[PDB]
């Protein structure tokens, strides 16, 4: 029941991964003004706060030294932020696909970390986060459907992607 | 008294230059929490709005399609935003020097554009903006002085820099 360095590394990654979702969705909201990005950004702020509560619980240094949109300590996220906002700027459909894409990445990463921890505190937050992301994914894809488009998964398997989109809400 | 294409190009540049100041100062405020960046960011929002009123007056397409921090249509500003936030992240003194630096650039550019226009509407906004920037410059440099530092001008001349800092407020 003490936390391991590995479990700390997971929380540090997820704290900024939820920020990546929040910041890309804010940025795309300011561009396209589709309410889904505003709504889900707020949910990502909730998710960020959930990770932060665990960071504080274990007195782990918060990787978010600057809450400004686009700012990250781990450059994998700074890179993804730049990549994804450039793709999302092209059209409403490209922005919705970027939404699905971030949810796809986040679900895959949440599974990765869930599987490395036996910690009831941590597992619980991750499960809740994953339930959230599956709902975000369903929301983005349904919106892509309204535009006569769809989504091809990149990080999660085809099979898990189909199980997410063929079900209702959690 | 009609506006020229050249005068339009000036307003389009300044609209995003004031955004550059605003966004860098927001970003540095979120990092360092020095009240000067919050205070002056608000002034830059006022300046942004002043340019926007002229853009609307002449129905010039606003270059700001996305108000999110860090987002620019003219890449000279996207580049300066990245350069300057990286420099400002290093220390409080480096952030204050970045403040002075943006004010320096903005004053030089405002002089450039002021000198290309006979338009009373435009000249007036630019003069007001310049009075603002000179006040921001004095505020940043005084803060650098509190940290035992100072500022070397990059864009304006030494002589105009000395005339700004040796005077009181406008
Ligand atoms: Zn999330
Ligand atoms: Zn999400
Ligand atoms: Zn200004
Ligand atoms: Zn200024």
UniProtKB/Swiss-Prot annotation, chains A, B:
Xref: InterPro entries: DUF2202, Ferritin-like, Ferritin-like_SF
Superkingdom of origin: Archaea
SUPFAM superfamilies to which the protein is assigned, alphabetical: Ferritin-like (SSF47240)
CDD domains linked: Ferritin_like_AB2 (cd01048)
Name of the molecule in the record: Uncharacterized protein MJ0754
Phylogenetic placement of the source organism: Archaea, Methanobacteriati, Methanobacteriota, Methanomada group, Methanococci
